[PDB]
Write a protein that binds this ligand. Structure first.
Ligand SMILES: [Mg+2]
Ligand SMILES: [Zn+2]
Ligand SMILES: [Zn+2]
Ligand SMILES: [Zn+2]
Ligand SMILES: [Zn+2]
Lengths: 1131, 115, 206, 67, 404, 46, 51
């Protein structure tokens, strides 16, 4: 029955494999989008108010149902055919499906003359579709079906195709809503502040933040204030309580202080009462609120109405926005004050801003919902204006012409295309970085980009606290994978078994709590709240309970049985403070864990047995979760959980550590993400090395996707001979690194050989490189289109001619065909022409606008595709193919942060060799190891020697006590090798033995995208910028290198004044001006007629020539634009 | 972009001499032999054969740059001898050694295939 | 029409070993040939023409490299070991090409390297102490060692020099291993002879 | 994508061994014994056969450009 | 040309070079001139500027050329020195038991540019002629400079007792009349510190002679290292069973000591020291215990090393690494700190959900009792990732403020 | 002169002249590919 | 204070133990792109005509 330790390493990984058979790696994206389409769009459409318009006749126009068909593309002819994602990629279409809404317009004029007209399936917009979602044409297709459609079966999906560009929505971090968080700002007028970003269940407005603060000590005592929304002045809490109908101080403290035996709380609230005694009735308090507001009505009536509306709608919407909710709002605001007092009295800890239990991940669904709310509101507005301008004339109108569908369509398309998350007009208030271009450089880069999280703290911020690896990231975020540049700690990555909750309605839970012995908050007396336990659901205090323990037992039983409580519902019992917080909302990152009985796992051997035959008896992960054996625990419920790292922790020990565990890790290696799960032996490296590899696995070459032959990507690198690593971890089985690997096993020798590998460089074998070692192919796609925008000027693909075309370069166009497009198989060098495009003029009647190769490439045309774009003019894509043979300067890396460029390449006779004539493919310098402490590199090399000599794949899973260095060495000594991986090598040049026995063996190396040929650049008098006549910027522009301020300072320190003048004047922008010797302002010179005159001074004899930079002339002219007179006085 | 053709390691450029002899002025009876389009394969054997001559006081070689395709062999001999004569005799001795080794390897192969 | 681009196929064809035993001495380098781009005195013509019409995958192997010279053929195609795989083709895919094989050696490209490993060793017992084992007991014995198992390395020989070099020359297939050794000795001797000729011209010109 | 022709390290031909290697593996050989049957004794050539991923078999799941 | 690397921090980040045209498509640099640029070859790119007049060319040739840039005015010492392979190898080369044969010596003399063509009389004439590494470095050393240094392993109690001028360990570098009379050369003798051989060469001999000195050290030593070789592998990370037992006993004793301090604090048997609160005093005691454990285990690992250990070779030469790195690879990685304190209670009174609440023990709060060869446990792995994230954040955040 | 293209879906060789919408005559598919040139490109098998 | 300049080049750096400290190894393509305006004289008339 029990899984014994000897079977555990199989059982756990069997369980893990079942998880990845059920979910995958992009499950969060697909589930978010599916919830958005199934629920969020319908909720948004129904939550909009019916637009009642009347001059008389009236019309309501109620939207009642939505229909999202499959993605479809319509041609000029109008025939209807399904649009496949690959066709969208090739034709630069948007993989979107039409959204139709049912509309009901009832005519009501008078005399009960009512009649309803329903417009079924009114086309309301187009919604882009996430690939492999339920509403994707690739849904449920087999691998054969996907290959029939020219799709990769290993492609995870989880992205959109907007204008042929694959866009991926990055999950955005945000502070959780409807939760009270008591912080303390050191530099502020308030000692403690308790904030609550409140938002109603079905979002319709932004988060309304309410603060309840305490004024810092230094009138008599500490005063509690409340910064309500839409009010620009602090308001005492007692005033707010009275404005809600609680005038008696006893009632207010009944709502705030639940234990009247506690004078400390009492004296700390007393200043607030003493400050609010002149106001003692609800109307006067409402008048005070309205007066403190930023729109103080001259008459107290409208002041009181405004205060009523604010306190009913903007104050704590999550508690309830309807009327008669003042009791719930009063209880909740009293809870906020109670929490603030507990913090000020030291009875509760301040809340941690960085705790991921306090955060939420805004995924594709809830982000598209924000867009859709804004866009549907704008659409209903436009419909209101259109219908108003017609009914004002007293006649009917056609809603089909009122609905301008471009709002929703173009809005979603623009937002996903650019990443600016918001309305196109508010292009600066909008937050960019959402919806990035999917990284297709290697399969690991694609997976990681699809599992990418973002902390929008702002890269400019230099506070390290949000960048720090918090304790609560354990199991939810990769500890290693993070960019090492300016976004350290802000851009994160999901751990492998991390699941972001999609969201759920609290209705069944609330109904069960009602049927259960919970007492509502309006029905109780406050005297009961002392000993009772509060119950919050999605932040709303809904009631109280008397035995929280058996309530938690009941709820956990219900969630483990897949009863009314779904698996993703978090249920935290804080014991010391008697809250029970239940969460069903979306964005809660959680992970699966094995539940533990008294001191035993519930995962018995029968579950492993049924999981082994997963493909026959359809016993899956969901059956494991439904059995009550596995549980999803979120960051906030982990605080109440006692984990076992392994079932070995559940053994009874000579001194028991815990003996009351509640859960167990499925495997600790699941704390790593996609790119860190490729590192072998990451627990033997320094952690920065693991981070650098997690970044560098994403630039590694491989086969980024199986269907690369049909993709017209702008840039693509494919390795000739990708190999799976000889030394692998058990997590790559689910990353599909074995099916799409990104490196080669290289016989690497760590040695000092000729000095060409010093300081992070490598010596490669020229003979190996000749045999296809780390050879790659580079595919570059050029796009072009001939626009017939108007009869004024039209472009067209056609072989240009020297007699008709004007802007025709001296490059030869013979490689083009009569259609103007080069043919595949044609070898093209730099500056060559691949598309001959000519544009009609207003060298006559047509000018050359041909597409050249990006300079200095020298490839062969791989293929040419011609089609029609969305509007329907001819559209061409040409993929050119360039074989990249590794060379000096190309960057290579192992899986341990050990990067370096090729210093030199030696032939096989020049490389050092073992007694059996094995030469290293790569030689790396021993000095790269000691400071870096990448012992995982050495253990991987030794394990790889054992694996190659044994005919297996080494197990480098991080935390594995069945694999240590002594075992690997003992294994290697059985194959006739030195047990530590050393060998006697001979000098290739002289054949003499090397005195020091070299450490050599197979290690998995990666070829990175950074090849020297894509970086080398030179300039000598090339093109210049228009504004300031200085060299351009970039290799692509043939630009010059920037001689910056620091270079100026260095050369000033050198004392090199002529070199400094050469760099900053003569090699950048030499120029001449003519200055009036009297006024010092630039004069008018006419060198052809030799007439120089200053219009200002009315002189034409006292002019002087001045040699100045063009940028300085431009500066002085831009100062004269500002009415400044910079007078260059030559005397 | 900058890859030299692989034959440039073996083939002489037009007007480029296979070997150049330059008198070393630091010490007497020393010469520098700059041999183009050769590498350690001939340099090592020529040096080691020259070291077998008791009339050779110095015999060394270097590949000044691996990316370049020449070697320099410095030979100093006793005053009654010459570095050019030493170099010639070293090549003659290497040729005779290789001829003998080839004939003996042919004989050994014949014995092995026959019995 | 195969799934491997043209340079992939070309590179892959270059690495197929061709029987070179008696023909390599007769052929000339195209540098030395007085012909045009090609001729039968400096090159060998190959042709390959395969089309997958049937439903199973067609393995375009080195057996499909048809030569004009019967003496120079792919090693695997010589009259066991299977044929080298050039490319797998799907129904409707087709590969038709025309190759020319030339004379060269491993300095120019590893495809002209005739060896599949050259094991070279000397002083199997570390008597010259050209290696210094920190723990001589930890190291396995060479196959050419003559030491009793208690003895880890031979006693140090102060008057010793490297003699008795052991070789294991494995052939890729193009040449016989003994032909590799004989051709190596002849090539080294002709390198030295050419060097001596140029040396004599330099000495007499001075 | 396809089995290399030569071993990158020594230059031994491995191109003719992938199919035989797979046939030995379905014959219930261990990978080590299979590599021994094909004569791959240096761990470089064993690396070549043992770490190869036959991606061409997946690229042949797509219909060609011409029928 | 002027050769530059960004960020251009000081005047040595832009130096004058003479162009040497070479086949492939990278900028090829000498390895001594990498420290001034702060340049390594992990994908770094550098900028070449070509002066376009005879006046600017003369300016750069007389002011900014690299040999004129050997000594920096910032700290009146060399800015470039001997570096990784050449430094490990010159340390191994100038050891007392390095004996070169006639052919090896001639091979090395081929790579001396400043060689008068006279083979020096070997240090050993019989039974077999043998030159020493010091005897060849004496030929590399220019002029008649005089220098006294001490190898990094020089015992501090040797200059007092006898054998001061005849060092048993071949420490106490002494160069006289441009001959390395004795001592093992290392970072202290050929690095960028003040009073080293490269500095004294620049001060006594010109910048040209010093340029040749740098080049000759590099060429001769690299071509000798082709014979000697240098490596690193698992065998250098391993220690003997006695050392492992000593380290584990040290760690066990340290954990029991921390348990004793915890028990004292729990029983109110701990009184605070002046200037600190009780929490801070407990933290000081625990951190002192664990730092003592780390240092003792590191000393155990360091003494366990042999003379053939390659970690010890690179640390001794000063080429790369430190004794703390050896301790972390062999003995114990040690305490992980976030903001200068132990791992914070990021959960509620816990560092991770795997620990009990209020657990101030060493493993709970981030003491990695394993080495990098042993491998970190999952909690040690996460805490080490936290500590390393602190360094990454510091490196990425200090740059803007320091540049401003 | 003819500029025959191949269909991305039906793989049909069909001729299309300039100023013609890009449509396969056999199935109407909108994506077409050019055929391999007849020019003689040479590869050094290296 | 800082600006783009002509006669500049940039590429990856690489080790070269066989250069002196004051040398820089330059590709032939960078050197073929970059030029130095040398004045003609009877001292260099022949060499510059050759170039
Ligand atoms: Mg760098
Ligand atoms: Zn004027
Ligand atoms: Zn010919
Ligand atoms: Zn091999
Ligand atoms: Zn068609």
């Amino acid at each position: 029955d029990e899984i014994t330790p000897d079977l555990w390493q199989e059982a756990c990984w069997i369980v893990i494999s079942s998880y990845f058979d059920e979910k995958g790696l992009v499950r969060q994206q697909l589930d978010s989008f599916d919830e958005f389409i199934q629920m969020s769009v319908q909720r948004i459409v129904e939550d909009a108010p019916p637009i009642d318009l009347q001059a008389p006749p009236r019309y309501l126009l109620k939207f009642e149902q939505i229909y999202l068909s499959k993605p479809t593309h319509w041609e000029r002819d109008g025939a209807p055919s399904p649009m496949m994602p690959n066709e969208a990629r090739l034709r630069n279409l948007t993989y979107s499906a039409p959204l139709y809404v049912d509309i009901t317009k009832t005519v009501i004029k008078e005399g009960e003359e009512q009649l309803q007209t329903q417009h079924q399936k009114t086309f309301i917009g187009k919604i882009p579709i996430m690939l492999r979602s339920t509403y994707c044409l690739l849904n449920g297709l087999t691998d054969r079906d996907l290959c029939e459609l020219n799709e990769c079966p290993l492609d995870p999906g989880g992205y959109f195709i907007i204008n042929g560009s694959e866009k991926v929505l990055i999950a955005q971090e945000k502070m959780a809503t409807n939760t009270v968080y008591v912080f303390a700002k050191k530099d502020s007028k308030y000692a403690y502040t308790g904030e609550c970003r409140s938002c109603l269940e079905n979002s319709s407005r932004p988060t309304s933040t309410i603060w309840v603060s305490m004024l810092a000590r230094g009138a008599i005592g500490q005063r509690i204030v409340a910064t309500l929304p839409y009010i620009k002045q602090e308001v005492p809490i007692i005033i707010v309580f009275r404005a809600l109908g609680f005038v008696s101080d006893r009632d207010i403290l009944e709502h705030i202080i639940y234990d009247f035996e506690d004078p400390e709380m009492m004296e700390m609230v007393k200043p607030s009462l003493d400050e609010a005694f002149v106001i003692q009735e609800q109307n006067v308090a409402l008048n005070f609120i309205g007066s403190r507001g930023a729109k103080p009505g001259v008459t107290k009536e409208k002041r009181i109405k405004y205060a009523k509306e604010v306190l009913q709608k903007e104050m704590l919407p999550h508690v309830g926005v309807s009327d008669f909710c003042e009791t719930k709002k009063a209880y909740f605001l009293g809870y906020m004050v109670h929490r603030l007092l507990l913090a000020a009295l030291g009875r509760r800890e301040l809340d941690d801003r960085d705790h991921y239990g306090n955060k939420r991940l805004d995924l594709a669904g809830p982000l598209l919902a924000f867009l859709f709310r804004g866009m549907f509101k704008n659409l209903l507005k436009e419909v209101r204006i259109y219908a108003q301008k017609f009914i004002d004339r007293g006649k009917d109108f056609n809603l089909e012409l009122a609905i301008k569908t471009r709002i929703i369509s173009d809005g979603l398309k623009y937002s996903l295309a650019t990443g600016n998350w918001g309305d196109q007009k508010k292009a600066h208030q909008a937050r960019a970085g959402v919806s990035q271009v999917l990284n297709r450089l290697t399969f690991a880069s694609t997976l990681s980009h699809l599992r990418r999280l973002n902390s929008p703290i702002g890269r400019d911020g230099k506070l390290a606290k949000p960048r720090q690896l918090h304790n609560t990231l354990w199991g939810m975020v990769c500890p290693a994978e993070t960019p090492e540049g300016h976004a350290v700690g802000l851009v994160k990555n999901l751990a492998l078994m991390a699941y972001i909750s999609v969201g759920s309605q609290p209705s069944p839970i609330l109904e069960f709590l009602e049927e259960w012995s919970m007492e509502n908050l309006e029905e109780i007396s406050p005297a009961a709240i002392a000993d009772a336990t509060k119950i919050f659901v999605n932040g709303c205090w809904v009631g109280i309970h008397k035995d929280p323990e058996q309530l938690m037992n009941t709820l956990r039983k219900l969630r483990r049985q897949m009863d009314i409580i779904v698996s993703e519902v978090s249920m935290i019992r804080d014991i010391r403070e008697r809250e029970i917080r239940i969460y069903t909302d979306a964005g809660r990152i959680c992970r699966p864990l094995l539940i533990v009985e008294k001191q035993k796992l519930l995962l018995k051997k029968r579950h492993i047995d049924q999981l082994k035959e997963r493909e026959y008896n359809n016993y899956s992960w969901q059956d494991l979760v439904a059995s009550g054996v596995v549980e999803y625990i979120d960051t906030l419920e982990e605080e109440t959980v006692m984990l076992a790292m392994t079932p070995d922790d559940l053994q009874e020990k000579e001194v028991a550590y815990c003996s009351t565990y509640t859960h167990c890790e499925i495997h600790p290696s699941m704390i790593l993400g996609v790119c860190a799960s490729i590192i072998p032996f990451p627990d033997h490296n320094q952690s920065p090395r693991n981070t650098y590899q997690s970044a560098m696995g994403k630039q590694a070459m491989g086969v980024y996707i199986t269907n690369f032959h049909v993709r017209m990507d702008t840039l693509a690198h494919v390795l000739y001979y990708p190999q799976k690593p000889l030394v692998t971890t058990r997590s790559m089985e689910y990353l599909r690194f074995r099916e799409l690997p990104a490196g080669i096993n290289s016989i690497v020798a760590i040695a000092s050989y000729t000095g060409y590998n010093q300081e992070d460089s490598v010596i490669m074998n020229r003979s190996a490189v000749d045999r296809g070692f780390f050879r790659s192919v580079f595919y570059r796609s050029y796009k072009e289109q001939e626009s017939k925008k108007g009869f004024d000027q039209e472009e067209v693909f056609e072989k240009p001619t020297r007699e008709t075309c004007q802007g025709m370069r001296h490059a030869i166009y013979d490689k083009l065909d009569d259609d103007g497009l080069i043919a595949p198989g044609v070898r093209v060098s730099g500056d060559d022409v691949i598309i001959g495009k000519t544009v009609t003029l207003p060298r006559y009647t047509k000018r050359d606008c041909s597409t050249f190769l990006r300079t200095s490439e020298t490839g062969i045309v791989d293929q040419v595709m011609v089609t029609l774009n969305q509007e329907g003019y001819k559209f061409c894509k040409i993929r050119v193919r360039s074989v990249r043979i590794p060379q000096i300067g190309d960057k290579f890396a192992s899986r341990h942060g050990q990067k370096g460029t090729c210093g030199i390449q030696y032939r096989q006779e020049d490389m050092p060799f073992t007694c059996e004539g094995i030469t290293p493919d790569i030689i790396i310098n021993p000095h790269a190891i000691p400071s870096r402490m990448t012992i995982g590199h050495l253990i991987e090399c030794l394990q790889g020697k054992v694996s190659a000599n044994k005919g297996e794949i080494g197990d480098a899973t991080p935390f594995n006590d069945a694999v240590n260095v002594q075992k690997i060495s003992n294994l290697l000594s059985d194959y006739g090798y030195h047990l530590r991986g050393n060998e006697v090598l001979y000098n290739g040049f002289t054949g003499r033995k090397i005195t020091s026995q070299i450490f050599i063996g197979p290690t998995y190396y990666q070829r990175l995208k950074h090849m020297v040929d894509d970086k080398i650049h030179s300039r000598a008098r090339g093109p210049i910028q228009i504004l300031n006549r200085q060299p351009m910027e970039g290799r692509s522009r043939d630009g010059g290198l920037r001689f910056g301020e620091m270079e100026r300072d260095c050369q000033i320190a050198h004392g090199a004044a002529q070199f400094l003048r050469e760099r900053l004047f003569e090699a950048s922008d030499p120029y001449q001006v003519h200055v009036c010797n009297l006024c010092g302002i630039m004069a008018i010179a006419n060198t052809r007629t030799h007439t120089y005159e200053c219009r200002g001074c009315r002189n034409k004899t006292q002019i002087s020539l001045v040699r100045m930079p063009y940028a300085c002339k431009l500066l002085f002219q831009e100062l004269m634009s500002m009415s400044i007179a910079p007078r260059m006085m030559s005397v | 972009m900058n890859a030299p053709p692989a034959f440039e390691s073996f083939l002489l450029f037009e007007g480029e001499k296979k070997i150049t002899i330059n008198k070393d002025t630091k010490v007497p009876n020393a010469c520098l032999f700059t041999i183009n389009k050769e590498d350690h394969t001939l340099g090592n054997i020529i040096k080691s054969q020259l070291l077998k001559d008791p009339q050779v006081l110095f015999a060394g070689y270097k590949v000044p740059h691996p990316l370049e395709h020449k070697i320099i062999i410095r030979v100093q001999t006793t005053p009654d001898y010459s570095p050019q004569e030493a170099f010639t005799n070293a090549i003659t001795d290497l040729i005779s050694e290789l001829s003998l080794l080839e004939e003996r390897f042919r004989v050994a192969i014949k014995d092995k295939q026959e019995g | 029409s195969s799934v491997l681009h043209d340079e992939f196929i070309a590179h892959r064809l270059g690495l197929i070993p061709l029987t070179s035993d008696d023909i390599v001495d007769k052929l000339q380098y195209s540098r030395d040939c007085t012909c045009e781009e090609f001729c039968p005195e400096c090159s060998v013509e190959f042709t390959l023409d395969v089309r997958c019409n049937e439903d199973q995958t067609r393995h375009v192997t080195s057996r499909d490299l048809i030569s004009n010279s019967p003496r120079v053929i792919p090693v695997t195609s010589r009259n066991e070991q299977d044929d080298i795989l050039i490319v797998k083709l799907r129904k409707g895919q087709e590969l038709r090409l025309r190759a020319y094989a030339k004379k060269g050696f491993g300095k120019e490209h590893a495809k002209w390297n005739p060896t599949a490993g050259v094991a070279f060793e000397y002083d199997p017992d570390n008597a010259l102490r050209h290696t210094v084992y920190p723990k001589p007991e930890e190291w396995p014995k060479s196959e050419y060692s003559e030491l009793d198992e208690d003895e880890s390395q031979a006693p140090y020989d102060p008057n010793g020099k490297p003699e008795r070099f052991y070789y294991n020359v494995e052939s890729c297939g193009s040449l016989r291993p003994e032909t590799i050794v004989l051709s190596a000795l002849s090539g080294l001797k002709k390198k030295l002879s050419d060097l001596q000729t140029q040396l004599s011209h330099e000495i007499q010109s001075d | 994508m396809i089995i290399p022709v030569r071993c990158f390290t020594c230059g031994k031909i491995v191109g003719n061994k992938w199919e035989a290697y797979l046939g030995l593996l379905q014959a219930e050989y261990t990978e080590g014994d299979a590599l021994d049957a094909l004569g791959l004794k240096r761990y470089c050539c064993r690396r070549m056969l043992l770490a190869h991923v036959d991606l061409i078999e997946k690229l042949l799941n797509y219909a060609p450009l011409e029928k | 040309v002027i050769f530059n690397r960004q960020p251009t921090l000081h005047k040595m980040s832009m130096m004058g070079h003479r162009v040497r045209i070479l086949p492939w498509s990278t900028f090829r640099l000498n390895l001594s001139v990498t420290t001034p640029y702060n340049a390594d070859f992990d994908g770094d790119e550098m900028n070449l500027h070509l002066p376009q007049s005879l006046e600017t060319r003369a300016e750069i040739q007389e002011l900014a050329m690299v040999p004129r840039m050997i000594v920096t005015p910032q700290s009146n010492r060399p800015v470039m020195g001997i570096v990784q392979d050449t430094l490990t190898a010159v340390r191994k080369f100038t050891k007392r038991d390095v004996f070169l044969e006639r052919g090896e010596v001639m091979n090395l003399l081929m790579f001396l540019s400043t060689w008068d063509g006279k083979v020096p009389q070997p240090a050993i004439l019989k039974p077999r002629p043998l030159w020493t590494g010091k005897q060849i470095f004496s030929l590399i050393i220019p002029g008649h400079i005089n220098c006294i240094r001490t190898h990094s392993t020089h015992p501090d109690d040797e200059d007092s007792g006898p054998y001061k001028h005849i060092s048993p360990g071949d420490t106490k570098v002494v160069v006289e009349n441009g001959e390395l009379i004795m001592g093992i050369l290392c970072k202290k003798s050929l690095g960028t510190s003040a009073g080293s051989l490269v500095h004294i060469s620049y001060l006594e001999m010109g910048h040209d002679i010093t340029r040749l000195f740098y080049s000759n050290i590099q060429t001769v030593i690299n071509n000798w290292l082709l014979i000697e070789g240098h490596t690193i592998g698992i065998g250098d990370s391993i220690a003997d069973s006695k050392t492992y037992q000593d380290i584990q006993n040290t760690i066990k004793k340290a954990k029991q000591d921390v348990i004793e301090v915890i028990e004292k604090a729990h029983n109110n048997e701990l009184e605070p020291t002046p200037g600190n609160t009780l929490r801070q005093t407990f933290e000081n005691q625990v951190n002192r215990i664990l730092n003592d454990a780390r240092d003792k285990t590191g000393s155990s690992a360091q003494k366990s090393l042999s003379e053939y250990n390659n970690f010890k070779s690179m640390v001794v030469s000063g080429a790369k690494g430190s004794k703390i790195n050896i301790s972390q690879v062999i003995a114990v990685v040690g305490q992980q700190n976030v903001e200068g304190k132990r791992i914070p209670f990021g959960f509620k009174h816990r560092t991770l959900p795997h620990f009990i609440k209020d657990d101030y023990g060493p493993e709970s709060r981030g003491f990695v009792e394993n080495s990098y060869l042993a491998g970190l446990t999952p909690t040690e792995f996460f805490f080490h990732a936290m500590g390393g994230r602190e360094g990454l954040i510091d490196t990425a955040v200090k740059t803007a403020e320091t540049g401003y | 002169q003819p500029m025959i293209y191949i269909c991305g879906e039906c793989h049909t060789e069909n001729e299309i002249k300039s100023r013609d919408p890009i449509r396969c005559r056999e199935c109407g598919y909108r994506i077409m590919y050019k055929k391999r040139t007849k020019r003689l490109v040479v590869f050094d098998a290296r | 204070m800082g600006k783009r300049v002509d006669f500049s080049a940039r590429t990856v750096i690489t080790p070269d133990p066989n250069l002196s400290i004051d040398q820089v190894g330059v590709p032939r393509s960078i050197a073929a792109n970059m030029t130095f305006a040398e004045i003609v004289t009877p001292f260099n008339i022949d060499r510059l005509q050759e170039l």
